[PDB]
Design a protein around this ligand. Structure first.
Ligand SMILES: Nc1ncnc2c1ncn2[C@@H]1O[C@H](COP(=O)(O)OP(=O)(O)OP(=O)(O)O)[C@@H](O)[C@H]1O
Ligand SMILES: Nc1ncnc2c1ncn2[C@@H]1O[C@H](COP(=O)(O)OP(=O)(O)OP(=O)(O)O)[C@@H](O)[C@H]1O
Ligand SMILES: Nc1ncnc2c1ncn2[C@@H]1O[C@H](COP(=O)(O)OP(=O)(O)OP(=O)(O)O)[C@@H](O)[C@H]1O
Ligand SMILES: [Mg+2]
Ligand SMILES: [Mg+2]
Ligand SMILES: [Mg+2]
Lengths: 284, 289, 246, 101, 48, 304, 263, 106, 242
């Protein structure tokens, strides 16, 4: 393996070495930069991997990773710099998940303005992991507008869903944002639009949320947009999964592929907890 | 590592897409070509803003037909109007043949590939645009050394992507031993959309506007007359519909195409049309006087 | 989507035969046989019988039906003019003219009477003899008086100047006759199709030989219809094959 | 839904590269078969894994899709040129009930 | 694939031959690889 | 010159070209972009196939000073011949949003290029108008009959589109709207029916207020414009004439065809009602048989 | 530089069916005798003057004739080059023939003089009257005002040195010496054998005066053209074609036929 | 491969009227395309040219390769021309009329 | 250069006012569209049209198109010799004129008489008697449209192509009426029926049959006059003698 295939190997190690927090630093040591330098995928994939070990527990670790991001963000660098910078940014997201620190918000912001191709994606996601559920209005407003400024597609994708993550659990207070994201003519803003409804109204079978997601799924010709709406249903109807197979029978009837891809995923999420015999039968 | 490339998808703007078509239809059967003016950003977006057409040769498309002398002159003209940026490749037009690069087109491309490594070759088919879908595809040379190390998989990872086809045959052969094809998305802003949509001065001059009542008398007369004939086949037909197997009945007593469905369609089309014909008729009489 | 594919540009094939009902075999007018998809919302009951057909340009799919009236060799004269001559401008051969009003005129109008006696219908009509004899004059005459569609070829209107042109003409005239029956097919001279011997050791024979063989096949089908069977004329008396006279 | 989404699968089919009507003159047992595409040339060419070269026999009319020139399915309806020959010959239908004495 | 069958007019013994296909074009071929000069004799049907 | 002028057929590539060249000069805040218009003319319908930028400056403080580079245009035309040598200069695009009277002075310069009276095309870049967002004008010199001297003036030419066959499949290709300003189904045509009536309301309102201006604000009388408005009255329909009674009788005729057809569709559906009802009668047998059968299956699956 | 790209090899070959003609009115429509309908155009149906060509790919193409080739150099039956991948006429070419025809052409046959044809003095003087002297003393055909003889037959018993005299004394005087054979004229392809008589006389007329020495004369020296069930209708067909190209038809006086025969 | 052709007529490339570009007859003798312009009064177009007929039955005008000269190439002689763009590469033994003749040698 | 070549067909059969069937000159019959920049009433059968190669839509109507073989035949009209120059056979000139030159000049007096205007002359005699000279003498003096066609030079190598030549030759003489078509040395394609020999004998028959129906049948002629020059008329099919 080489390229991103080699990237995959190094960040898979930190799915395996999840937990055993004391020995997480140790096992990741010779793949961390300063003892690895053979390939830029290994050096970054240890940062992605290291975050995974410390996910949900990573308050100390957040400080340690933060030096590397500030270092390489006075530059936009070369593309070698990007692969390294990319795995630092996903890593601090995971470490600081649910923390609500402003330090991490601000740090990744300097990455986002570099406009790095792959690190911009990982920063955009990272803001959303750190600041899950807070509802800071400054965070919402800057991301949305920046989405139109950026010309790299990955960065838009990353921004769009990360807004959803920040407006988690906030229900009807997130309602104003939902309307701007849907009103757009940019597919990415709609792709992320679906997910904002999914996470804010998550686990409460609010009828208004399911209606938007349904209408949008059908009514847009754009492929990402369709797909995303379908996957969103599972999040909403997490509590009342009794109703999910009868609602989504419809989407699996239709022979558009992106629809059908998302229909499966919606059954995956919804009946994840405990199998429902019907769910399996529709997926066959 | 060396330097490691991944997928790209070529974003052909609305202005460029029509321009390529215009040039390709006009010079056919002769192969027509031209340079792509654009800008390259990201690692996944090749933005082709505009094209222009290079003078054609009877010696087709080749290494010596491009003309770099006329390019340098063309470049300055774009320079003074702010419409220069940086050249991102070339296009040419084959006629009745698929999207694929000929042996001569490999050698043309190889010279572009040295100058900019992110050079694309875009094949337009204009004799195959007679369908409701315009078949267009893009290619980009993968280096001879690369194929030995089998680095075509390297380009496929990091998304599922469309992995769309619209042509094979010659294309897939050439793919194995040279190039990697790129999928096509088209860019357009929310201004460009409205221009595209509007193709009528009959937006407000098409509901009060109407066809003479002679022509409506013809539609009424044809429609009523024919539905008798569909109705006589349906009568022969439904003397059955009580034997064994639907599929048999359809062959033997001519259930084919469904005469039941065919009568519904013919009735629905004229029924909806006359509501409009009256609806516009009365609207004019009452509002205008 | 599918309506733009239905419309033009289209090359004309001919439906040779079925092998499925959503897949057929056509020979196009490029001089190639193609296996093609067959689009729905079209005929299935004049489609499958040999008849002219539209196929799309480069895709090679049967996307439209083309009436058995169109792409014909010539059109009926039961809805145009007939040659305006009468059998009162025929002077002599009243003796030969008795047998031919017997062939044409009497089963066209009085088909019931032949079944009533139990006598077979009349069949094809041969006019043969040296060219002084007035053969044509009577055919022109009887076509006006009998009040039926009149059709028409000559065997150098079955000219093959493209490959597989010539057998397509045979299928055109006969299918058309059946459709607007009662009808009469005239083949003006057949000294090129009616050649006693053949070579078939070169390409130029075999196209004509195929015309002759197809000609025989459709006259055998033609029987027991209220059409009058082919009027035809020859020069010599030994143009005729023992196959075209049987 | 049944009417609109059948059509979209049907667009692929109509947009075929073309396909030809050949007949196998004789088999080669390396899973290649000598197939004379009938208005065109002779070609020795591999088959699909839907058919075997012992289901194909000389005088098998087959379909073969020119993108590799590879045989798909056999023609389920063959017609012999021997039918065309028998027609010329002609047998009048008669038993011993049309003679007597 | 496929194997374009032509009919061999004649070889010149130097590692080339003139063939005339049934599909009609004539081609100046090479006798080269898994084929010999003794296996090729007029009127034979050769595999291109 | 040529006096043959009728319509301006405009290709979609022309429309898009002037929006693009405006946005890549990034001219805004009422700063303009004037380029060349290319195409066929010496012809009654003026046929604009393509257009390209020309370097152009417009001064906004004083509007009576502008930059046009005469050298560029000739060079540029030569390179147009490379592309397609059926193109010559037949006019110029303006970037809108409207007609200006400083356009009269620009116009002089392009008479030493053309073989026709030069074309003025407003490509509105903000895409405003209830139909097409282009007005089209041509410069005429004429005596004025309201007792004043010979003016040079821009008289309106209608705008329509025709395009290449090739271009036409591309326009549709980018687009994915279902349209509501073009006609399709019944419901679509009701939406267009209403749009047309409100269109009429808008233009007609403007006529009443135009009349108001002449005699209270004092726009100059122009006999040529008001003269068509008189003809609106003479060609106007009337009520209770034997023409407007034919108009009712024709409605009664068409309504009867609609009645038979609604009823034909009802035949078809009552047959489809009986058919599915037979399907249910059939499926009843299967249902009965299934229950006795499922008895045997339950015990076996529990055994394993 | 554009023109030179197109001019460069290769290019396709067509003949000129006819020159159709179209008005130079591009300021509305063409109306030579065919009025144009619908829409008015500069140059999509209101084009300039026209050339119809027949290609060798088996088609015919209707183009506006090229503005660089004049309408005087286009006349029906000219052979002109045409662009290989379009179809515009670049240039004019001299009419090509078959390779059977190019065989007929001179190889510069050497003289062997009449003195090395021993004996037979009177016959040589008669044969010289026939071929040599209407060319030379063409001063005398213009004075006297007689017509030229269109050929001299040399017959007799075989082996009397017919062939040798002809070869020798034709090469002696200076004129085009064509090499044509009677048994050649009958070929296995129908009506190609006739065509080959027309190409031989064509070659004589470009290079006129020419003497066409026909070796043998008894292949086409067939006393039959009343036949019965044979391929002999092809044989006698090229005898009749010989008579049509010895039929007056202008610039044929200059061009003679020598012919040797044994029967 | 090479597309097998066969030459049908040597039309020598000077005196073919393969310059029409210069429309001037005031310059040159104008008996040939190299005598269309008298400044050089010499080569402005290839010295020798050829008309071939392919065995797909399509005639094209082809010229001189870089390894053949007109000593090598003659009328009636088979040639091989490059398959994609036609231009004489290599001369071949006389005619395609030969076939039974190759039997007769024993 | 920039005005590319378009392929020519002719209309076989109007199917509709938007859809026309053409037979091209590449071979294929198409259903083609119409561009609405030309007529739709001058598209009738037999009408020469050019159509596009890159959407196969009719661009425009064209006058008729006539073969270079029949253009060769017309460009032969030379021989400036007068009817004076026929010595001895001046009687034969009065006789020749009855059939050909009096209905040619004025067919109106032959209507009063009440017979069909006649056409056709056979010149037969033992050779060297100036049957060709007679053709060149009447070509000189009247000065009409003439077709001097060798009748064995209208056949060629290809098949069905000898029907195309002569069909359009009658097309030419109908247009440029009054026209006389000189068939000179008509004995090869004037031959007996045959057809128990080679395929050549069947080529004469297919061309001969095209000539018969085109002259008299359900197409007649009416101001075209035939002069047939044959050497012997015992070489001839009785159909053509008739
Ligand atoms: N019975 C008749 N009464 C009147 N005219 C006649 C009669 N018989 C023959 N004719 C005339 O003789 C001429 C030639 O005869 P016709 O046209 O019928 O030829 P045919 O015998 O079919 O020759 P072929 O063998 O070429 O077919 C015509 O003008 C025709 O009107
Ligand atoms: N009179 C002669 N003087 C010299 N040599 C002669 C003479 N007669 C015959 N020959 C020789 O015999 C050869 C054969 O005669 P040639 O071919 O010239 O003439 P011919 O009468 O047409 O006979 P054929 O056609 O039967 O060969 C001559 O080429 C020459 O070598
Ligand atoms: N009646 C005449 N008056 C004067 N000169 C004549 C006369 N008859 C013939 N000639 C001369 O004879 C020449 C040859 O006659 P021509 O070839 O035309 O004859 P034909 O009888 O058609 O024979 P064939 O077609 O078999 O050659 C004329 O060019 C002329 O010089
Ligand atoms: Mg007859
Ligand atoms: Mg001799
Ligand atoms: Mg004569």
């Amino acid at each position: 393996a080489q390229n991103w295939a080699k990237f995959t190997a190094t960040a898979s190690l930190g799915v395996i070495h999840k937990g055993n927090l004391l020995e997480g630093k140790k096992v990741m040591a010779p793949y961390l930069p300063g003892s690895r330098a053979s390939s830029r995928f290994i050096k970054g994939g240890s940062l992605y991997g290291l975050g995974l070990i410390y996910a949900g527990f990573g308050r100390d670790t957040t400080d340690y990773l933060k030096n590397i991001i500030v270092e390489n963000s006075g530059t936009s660098g070369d593309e070698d710099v990007d692969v390294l910078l990319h795995g630092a940014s996903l890593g601090i997201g995971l470490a600081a998940m649910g923390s609500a620190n402003i330090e991490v918000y601000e740090a990744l912001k300097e990455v986002l303005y570099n406009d790095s191709a792959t690190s911009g994606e990982a920063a955009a996601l990272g803001m959303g992991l750190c600041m899950l559920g807070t509802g800071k209005p400054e965070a919402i407003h800057d991301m949305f507008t920046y989405s139109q400024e950026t010309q790299h597609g990955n960065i838009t994708r990353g921004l769009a869903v990360g807004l959803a993550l920040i407006n988690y659990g906030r229900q009807e207070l997130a309602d104003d944002l939902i309307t701007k994201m849907l009103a757009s003519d940019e597919s990415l803003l709609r792709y992320g639009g679906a997910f904002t409804i999914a996470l804010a109204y998550a686990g409460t079978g609010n009828n208004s949320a399911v209606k938007r997601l349904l209408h949008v799924a059908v009514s847009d010709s754009n492929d990402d947009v369709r797909r995303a709406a379908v996957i969103a249903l599972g999040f909403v109807l997490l509590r009342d999964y009794t109703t999910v197979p009868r609602i989504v029978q419809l989407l699996s009837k239709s022979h558009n592929a992106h629809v059908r891809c998302g229909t499966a995923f919606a059954l995956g999420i919804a009946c994840a907890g405990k199998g429902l015999q019907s769910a399996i039968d529709v997926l066959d | 590592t060396g330097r490691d490339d991944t997928k790209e998808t070529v974003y052909i703007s609305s202005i460029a897409l029509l321009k390529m078509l215009k040039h390709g239809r006009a010079g056919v059967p002769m192969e027509v070509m031209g340079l792509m003016l654009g800008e390259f950003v990201d690692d996944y977006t090749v933005n082709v803003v505009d094209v222009f057409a290079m003078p054609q040769s009877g010696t087709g498309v080749s290494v010596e037909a491009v003309d770099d002398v006329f390019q340098a002159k063309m470049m300055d003209m774009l320079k003074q109007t702010g419409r220069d940026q940086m050249v991102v490749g070339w296009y040419h037009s084959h006629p009745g043949f698929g999207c694929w690069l000929s042996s001569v087109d490999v050698n043309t491309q190889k010279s572009f590939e040295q100058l900019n490594s992110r050079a694309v070759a875009v094949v337009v088919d204009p004799i195959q645009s007679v369908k409701g879908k315009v078949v267009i595809d893009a290619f980009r040379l993968i280096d001879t050394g690369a194929l030995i190390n089998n680095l075509e998989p390297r380009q496929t990872t990091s998304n599922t992507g469309l992995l769309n086809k619209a042509n094979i045959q010659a294309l897939i052969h050439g793919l194995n031993r040279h190039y990697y094809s790129l999928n096509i998305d088209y860019h357009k802003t929310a201004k460009e959309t409205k221009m595209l949509m509007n193709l009528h001065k009959e937006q407000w001059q098409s509901g009060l506007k109407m066809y003479d009542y002679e022509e409506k008398e013809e539609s009424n007369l044809a429609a009523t007359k024919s539905m008798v004939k569909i109705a006589e086949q349906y009568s022969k037909r439904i003397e059955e519909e009580k034997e064994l197997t639907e599929e048999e009945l359809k062959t033997r007593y001519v259930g084919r195409q469904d005469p039941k469905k065919h009568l519904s369609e013919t009735a629905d089309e004229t029924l909806e049309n006359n509501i409009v014909s009256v609806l516009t008729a009365g609207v004019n009489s009452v509002a205008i006087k | 989507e599918v309506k733009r594919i239905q419309s033009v540009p289209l090359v004309i094939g001919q439906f040779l035969e079925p092998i499925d009902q959503n897949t057929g075999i056509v020979s196009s007018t490029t001089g190639m046989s193609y296996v093609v998809r067959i689009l729905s919302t079209l005929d299935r009951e004049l489609l499958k019988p040999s008849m002219s057909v539209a196929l799309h340009r480069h895709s090679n799919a049967l996307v439209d039906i083309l009436p058995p009236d169109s792409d014909s060799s010539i059109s009926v004269m039961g809805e145009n003019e007939k040659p305006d001559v009468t059998y009162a401008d025929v002077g002599g051969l009243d003796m030969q003219k008795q047998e031919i009003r017997e062939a044409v005129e009497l089963p066209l109008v009085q088909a019931d009477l032949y079944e009533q006696i139990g006598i077979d219908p009349p069949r094809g009509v041969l006019l043969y003899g040296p060219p002084g004899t007035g053969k044509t004059m009577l055919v022109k005459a009887v076509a006006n008086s009998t009040k039926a569609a009149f059709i028409r070829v000559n065997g150098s209107e079955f000219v093959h100047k493209y490959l597989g042109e010539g057998p397509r003409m045979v299928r055109d005239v006969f299918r058309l006759a059946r459709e607007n029956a009662p009808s009469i097919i005239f083949i003006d001279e057949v000294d090129s199709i009616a050649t006693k011997r053949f070579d078939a050791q070169t390409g130029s024979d075999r196209e004509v030989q195929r015309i002759l063989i197809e000609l025989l096949t459709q006259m055998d089908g033609f029987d027991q219809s209220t059409n009058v069977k082919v009027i035809m004329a020859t020069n010599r008396a030994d143009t005729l094959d023992p196959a075209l006279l049987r | 839904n049944d009417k609109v989404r059948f059509i979209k699968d049907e667009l692929r089919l109509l947009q075929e590269p073309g396909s030809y009507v050949g007949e196998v003159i004789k088999i080669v047992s390396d899973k290649k078969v000598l197939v004379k595409v009938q208005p065109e040339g002779k070609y020795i060419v591999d088959v699909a894994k839907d058919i075997n070269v012992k289901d194909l026999k000389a005088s098998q009319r087959v379909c073969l899709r020119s993108d590799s020139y590879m045989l798909h399915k056999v023609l389920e309806n063959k017609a012999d040129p021997l039918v065309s020959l028998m027609m010329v010959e002609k047998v009048p239908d008669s038993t011993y009930d049309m003679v007597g004495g | 694939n496929p194997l374009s069958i032509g009919t061999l007019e004649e070889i010149i013994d130097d590692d080339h031959a003139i063939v005339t296909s049934p599909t009609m074009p004539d081609y100046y071929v090479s006798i080269l690889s898994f084929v010999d000069k003794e296996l090729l004799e007029p009127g034979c049907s050769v595999l291109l | 010159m040529s006096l043959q002028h009728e319509k301006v057929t405009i290709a979609p590539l022309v429309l898009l070209s002037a929006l693009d060249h405006y946005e890549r000069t990034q001219t805004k805040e009422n700063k303009r972009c004037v380029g060349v218009i290319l195409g066929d003319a010496n012809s009654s319908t003026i046929r604009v196939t393509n257009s390209f930028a020309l370097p152009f400056e417009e001064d906004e403080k004083n509007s009576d000073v502008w930059f046009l580079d005469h050298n560029y245009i000739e060079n540029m035309n030569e390179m147009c011949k490379k592309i397609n040598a059926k193109e010559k200069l037949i006019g110029w695009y303006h970037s809108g949003p409207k007609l200006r009277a400083s356009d009269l002075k620009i116009n002089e310069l392009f008479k030493k290029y053309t073989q026709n009276n030069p074309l003025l095309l407003i490509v509105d870049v903000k895409q405003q108008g209830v139909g097409l967002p282009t007005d089209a004008y041509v410069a005429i010199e004429q005596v004025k009959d309201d007792g004043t001297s010979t003016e040079k003036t821009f008289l309106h030419l209608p705008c329509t589109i025709e395009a290449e066959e090739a271009e036409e499949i591309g326009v549709e290709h980018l687009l994915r709207d279902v349209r509501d300003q073009a006609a399709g189904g019944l419901s679509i045509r009701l939406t267009n029916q209403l749009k047309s009536l409100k269109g009429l309301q808008s233009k007609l309102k403007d006529v009443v207020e135009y009349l108001d201006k002449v005699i209270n604000k004092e726009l100059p009388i122009n006999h040529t414009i008001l003269g068509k408005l008189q003809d609106v009255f003479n060609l106007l329909p009337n009520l209770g004439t034997p023409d407007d009674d034919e108009i009712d009788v024709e409605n009664h005729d068409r309504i009867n065809i609609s009645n038979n057809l609604q009823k034909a569709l009802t035949v078809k559906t009552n047959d489809e009602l009986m058919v599915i009802y037979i399907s249910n009668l059939v499926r009843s047998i299967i249902a009965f048989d299934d229950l006795i059968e499922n008895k045997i299956q339950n015990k076996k699956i529990q055994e394993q | 530089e554009k023109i030179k790209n197109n001019r460069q090899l290769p290019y396709l070959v067509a003949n000129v069916v006819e020159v159709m003609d179209m008005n130079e009115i591009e300021d509305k429509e063409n109306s030579e005798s065919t009025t144009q309908g619908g829409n008015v155009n500069l140059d999509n149906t209101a084009v300039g003057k026209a050339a119809v060509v027949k290609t060798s790919s088996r088609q015919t193409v209707f183009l506006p004739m090229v503005g660089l080739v004049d309408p005087d150099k286009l006349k029906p039956n000219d052979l002109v080059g045409v662009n290989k991948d379009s179809y515009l006429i670049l240039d004019t070419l001299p009419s090509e023939f078959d390779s059977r025809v190019k065989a007929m052409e001179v190889d510069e046959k050497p003289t062997e003089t009449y003195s090395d044809v021993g004996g037979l003095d009177k016959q040589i003087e008669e044969l010289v009257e026939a071929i040599v002297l209407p060319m030379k003393r063409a001063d005398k055909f213009k004075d006297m005002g007689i017509r030229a003889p269109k050929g001299a037959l040399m017959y007799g018993p075989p082996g009397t040195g017919k062939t040798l005299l002809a070869r020798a004394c034709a090469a002696q005087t200076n004129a085009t010496f064509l090499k044509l054979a009677a048994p050649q004229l009958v070929q296995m392809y129908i009506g190609e054998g006739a065509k080959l008589v027309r190409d031989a006389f064509a070659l004589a007329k470009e290079k006129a005066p020419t003497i066409i020495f026909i070796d043998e004369l008894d292949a086409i020296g067939t006393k039959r053209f009343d036949s019965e069930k044979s391929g002999d209708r092809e044989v006698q067909r090229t005898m009749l074609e010989l008579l049509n190209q010895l039929d007056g038809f202008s610039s044929d006086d200059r061009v003679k036929v020598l012919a040797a025969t044994n029967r | 491969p090479l597309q097998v052709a066969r030459c049908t007529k040597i039309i020598k490339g000077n005196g073919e009227s393969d310059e029409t570009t210069t429309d001037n007859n005031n310059s040159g003798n104008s008996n040939s395309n190299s005598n269309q312009q008298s400044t050089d009064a010499d080569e402005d177009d290839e010295d020798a040219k050829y008309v071939i007929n392919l065995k797909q039955i399509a005639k094209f005008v082809v010229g001189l390769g870089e390894r053949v000269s007109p000593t090598d190439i003659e009328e009636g002689m088979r040639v091989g021309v490059d398959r994609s763009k036609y231009n004489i590469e290599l001369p071949l033994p006389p005619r395609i009329d030969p076939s039974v003749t190759m039997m007769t040698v024993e | 250069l920039q005005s590319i070549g378009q392929l020519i067909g002719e209309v076989m059969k109007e199917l509709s006012e938007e859809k026309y069937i053409v037979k091209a000159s590449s071979g294929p019959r198409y259903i083609v569209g119409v561009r609405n920049s030309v007529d739709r009433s001058k598209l009738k059968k037999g009408v020469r049209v050019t159509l596009d190669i890159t959407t196969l839509t009719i661009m425009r109507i064209l006058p008729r198109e006539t073969d270079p073989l029949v253009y060769n035949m017309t460009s032969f009209e030379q021989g400036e010799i007068t009817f004076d120059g026929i010595g001895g056979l001046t009687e034969q000139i009065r006789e020749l004129r009855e059939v050909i030159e009096l209905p040619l000049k004025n067919p109106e007096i032959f209507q009063r008489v009440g017979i069909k205007p006649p056409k056709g002359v056979l010149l037969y005699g033992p050779p060297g008697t100036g049957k060709t000279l007679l053709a060149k003498a009447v070509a000189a003096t009247i000065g009409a449209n003439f077709i001097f066609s060798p009748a064995s030079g209208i056949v060629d190598k290809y098949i069905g192509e000898s029907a195309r030549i002569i069909r359009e030759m009658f097309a030419y003489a109908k247009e440029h009426e009054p026209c006389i078509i000189f068939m000179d040395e008509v004995d090869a394609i004037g031959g007996r029926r045959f057809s128990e020999g080679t395929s050549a004998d069947r080529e004469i028959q297919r061309t001969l049959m095209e000539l018969l129906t085109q002259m008299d049948g359900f197409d007649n002629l009416g101001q075209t006059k035939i002069i047939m020059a044959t050497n012997r008329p015992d070489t001839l099919d009785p159909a053509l003698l008739r």
